[PDB]
Enzyme design. Structure first.
Site, PDB file in Angstrom:
ATOM      1  N   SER A 145       0.857  -1.197   0.000  1.00  0.00           N
ATOM      2  CA  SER A 145       0.000   0.000   0.000  1.00  0.00           C
ATOM      3  C   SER A 145       0.884   1.235   0.000  1.00  0.00           C
ATOM      4  O   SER A 145       1.725   1.369  -0.904  1.00  0.00           O
ATOM      5  CB  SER A 145      -1.043  -0.067   1.111  1.00  0.00           C
ATOM      6  OG  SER A 145      -1.683  -1.312   1.116  1.00  0.00           O
ATOM      7  N   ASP A 245      -7.976  -2.583  -7.143  1.00  0.00           N
ATOM      8  CA  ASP A 245      -7.550  -2.401  -5.766  1.00  0.00           C
ATOM      9  C   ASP A 245      -8.573  -1.547  -5.022  1.00  0.00           C
ATOM     10  O   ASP A 245      -9.043  -0.524  -5.529  1.00  0.00           O
ATOM     11  CB  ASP A 245      -6.188  -1.719  -5.728  1.00  0.00           C
ATOM     12  CG  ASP A 245      -5.625  -1.642  -4.333  1.00  0.00           C
ATOM     13  OD1 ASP A 245      -5.951  -0.685  -3.608  1.00  0.00           O
ATOM     14  OD2 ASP A 245      -4.887  -2.560  -3.933  1.00  0.00           O
ATOM     15  N   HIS A 294      -7.301  -5.795  -1.299  1.00  0.00           N
ATOM     16  CA  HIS A 294      -6.314  -4.811  -0.864  1.00  0.00           C
ATOM     17  C   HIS A 294      -5.126  -5.484  -0.193  1.00  0.00           C
ATOM     18  O   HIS A 294      -5.303  -6.206   0.793  1.00  0.00           O
ATOM     19  CB  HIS A 294      -6.931  -3.795   0.097  1.00  0.00           C
ATOM     20  CG  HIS A 294      -6.015  -2.657   0.420  1.00  0.00           C
ATOM     21  ND1 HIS A 294      -5.628  -2.347   1.707  1.00  0.00           N
ATOM     22  CD2 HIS A 294      -5.387  -1.769  -0.386  1.00  0.00           C
ATOM     23  CE1 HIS A 294      -4.813  -1.307   1.681  1.00  0.00           C
ATOM     24  NE2 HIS A 294      -4.650  -0.938   0.422  1.00  0.00           N
TER      25      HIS A 294
HETATM   26  C1  LIG Z   1      -0.687   8.312  -4.415  1.00  0.00           C
HETATM   27  C2  LIG Z   1      -1.150   7.347  -3.327  1.00  0.00           C
HETATM   28  C3  LIG Z   1      -0.263   6.924  -2.348  1.00  0.00           C
HETATM   29  C4  LIG Z   1      -0.688   6.047  -1.361  1.00  0.00           C
HETATM   30  C5  LIG Z   1      -2.001   5.603  -1.346  1.00  0.00           C
HETATM   31  C6  LIG Z   1      -2.482   4.616  -0.283  1.00  0.00           C
HETATM   32  N1  LIG Z   1      -1.744   4.128   0.882  1.00  0.00           N
HETATM   33  C7  LIG Z   1      -2.561   3.206   1.580  1.00  0.00           C
HETATM   34  C8  LIG Z   1      -2.199   2.576   2.685  1.00  0.00           C
HETATM   35  C9  LIG Z   1      -2.946   1.462   3.440  1.00  0.00           C
HETATM   36  C10 LIG Z   1      -4.309   1.290   3.619  1.00  0.00           C
HETATM   37  N2  LIG Z   1      -4.495   0.203   4.348  1.00  0.00           N
HETATM   38  N3  LIG Z   1      -3.283  -0.334   4.664  1.00  0.00           N
HETATM   39  C11 LIG Z   1      -3.058  -1.529   5.455  1.00  0.00           C
HETATM   40  C12 LIG Z   1      -2.342   0.415   4.127  1.00  0.00           C
HETATM   41  C13 LIG Z   1      -3.845   3.102   0.828  1.00  0.00           C
HETATM   42  O1  LIG Z   1      -4.777   2.428   1.101  1.00  0.00           O
HETATM   43  O2  LIG Z   1      -3.768   3.960  -0.295  1.00  0.00           O
HETATM   44  C14 LIG Z   1      -2.882   6.017  -2.332  1.00  0.00           C
HETATM   45  C15 LIG Z   1      -2.457   6.892  -3.319  1.00  0.00           C
HETATM   46  C16 LIG Z   1      -3.435   7.356  -4.397  1.00  0.00           C
END
Ligand SMILES: Cc1ccc(C2=N/C(=C/c3cnn(C)c3)C(=O)O2)cc1C
Ligand SMILES: *[C@@H]1O[C@H](CO)[C@@H](O)[C@H](O)[C@H]1NC(C)=O
EC number: 3.1.1.98
Length: 350
Positions: A145, A245, A294
């Site tokens: 993520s 996702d 996810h």
């Molecule tokens: C540009 C960008 C960068 C990061 C994310 C992002 N980081 C996450 C971390 C997460 C959620 N749940 N877990 C366990 C971890 C996520 O879901 O989306 C989304 C975008 C559009």
């Protein structure tokens, strides 16, 4: 279990100024090192970081971290759970910087929070060199993520750091899980591009040098998007990405509440999968199943999903072999072509 070590350089901190750290399980005799970056979204201004500090404090502070963690999935030391790298030296780096692993800013008179994700990775690497990493053959920087995007942002800097420190024999590679996002239009119209743009300024965020030189000042947010930053990277990177996702759908304002999907949303979802598949066409090491889900790599049943009959642990093993012309029966480019979530029967059951 993996045991917690807080960084000896206590100036490299989580958001609230507490020391960052890492969990380690050594495997003496193995020269493989897996350094895993945890995910967990991000925050981009004082107000949203304050809310995250109230109810997601473990993602902003080490004060309450446990002394140990169990390695799961790719971090498991049991061959049954981890056919790929069960004998490796295992490192779990908690995400406590809320900056997609991009920050290089300390808490100060002008900064309520420190955003030091990029420096945390550098300091973990430096401190591990004295704990056996100096003898490594392969350092796999993995993450899920926000941690998967963190791999893309940091793998070449780790490679450069080791070269500059005098360790040119360590092969640095990346494994980016669930961190390959599209800067697409929402299904219904804060947004990924704007939030990242604000975050970079708030965090003093840094991006890989070649990508920065392409997009130039003010446009560094582009480098947080896999399909834009990946072609600029020198280190080998294996990309794991569900075609549908859940985090991508969330930022796109799509929520599937069982009720029948009408034409506009059907077309939107099908085009999202097509776009994701297109961005992976020229990624030779990739695993992209047609599932709504996810993350994958640190869950205990990560072994179960297959694309074209090949599991992710097998694909990763084939990738290792390729880094010793394609291999008979050992593919590394595995992208589903079917166009709707769960058209792959091996998708997670949720
Ligand atoms: C540009 C960008 C960068 C990061 C994310 C992002 N980081 C996450 C971390 C997460 C959620 N749940 N877990 C366990 C971890 C996520 O879901 O989306 C989304 C975008 C559009
Ligand atoms: C500790 O980390 C800070 C921030 O990266 C750095 O400026 C400093 O040189 C480090 N100290 C040592 C002894 O490595």
């Amino acid at each position: 279990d993996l045991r917690l070590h807080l960084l000896l350089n206590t100036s490299v901190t989580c958001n609230d100024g507490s020391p960052a750290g890492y969990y380690l399980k050594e495997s003496r005799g193995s020269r493989r090192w897996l350094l895993f970056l945890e995910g967990g979204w991000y925050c981009f201004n004082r107000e949203n970081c304050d809310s995250r500090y109230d109810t997601m404090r473990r993602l902003m502070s080490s004060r309450d971290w446990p002394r140990t963690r169990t390695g799961t999935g790719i971090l498991s030391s049991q061959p049954e759970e981890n056919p790929y790298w069960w004998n490796a030296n295992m490192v779990f780096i908690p995400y406590c910087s809320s900056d997609v692993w991009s920050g290089a800013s300390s808490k100060s008179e002008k900064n309520e929070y420190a955003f030091m994700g990029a420096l945390i990775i550098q300091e973990v690497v430096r401190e591990l060199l004295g704990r056996g990493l100096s003898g490594a053959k392969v350092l796999l920087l993995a993450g899920s993520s926000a941690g998967g995007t963190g791999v893309l942002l940091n793998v070449d800097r780790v490679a450069e750091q080791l070269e500059k420190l005098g360790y040119p024999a360590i092969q640095v590679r990346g494994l980016a899980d669930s961190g390959w996002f599209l800067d697409n239009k929402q299904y219904r119209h804060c947004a990924p591009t704007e939030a990242i743009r604000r975050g970079i300024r708030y965090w003093n965020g840094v991006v890989p040098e070649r990508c920065r030189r392409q997009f130039q000042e003010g446009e560094e947010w582009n480098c947080f998007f896999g399909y834009k930053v990946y072609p600029t990277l020198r280190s080998p990177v294996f990309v794991v990405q569900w075609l549908f996702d859940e985090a991508q759908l969330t930022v796109d304002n799509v929520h599937l509440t069982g009720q029948p999907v009408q034409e506009g949303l059907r077309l939107y979802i099908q085009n999202l999968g097509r776009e994701l598949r297109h961005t992976l066409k020229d990624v030779p090491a990739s695993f992209a199943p047609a599932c709504l889900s996810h993350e994958i790599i640190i869950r205990s049943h990560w072994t179960d999903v297959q694309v074209k009959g090949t599991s992710l642990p097998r694909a990763l093993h084939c990738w290792d072999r390729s880094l010793h012309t394609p291999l008979k029966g050992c593919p590394v480019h595995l992208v589903d072509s079917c166009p709707w979530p769960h058209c792959n029967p091996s998708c997670p059951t949720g």
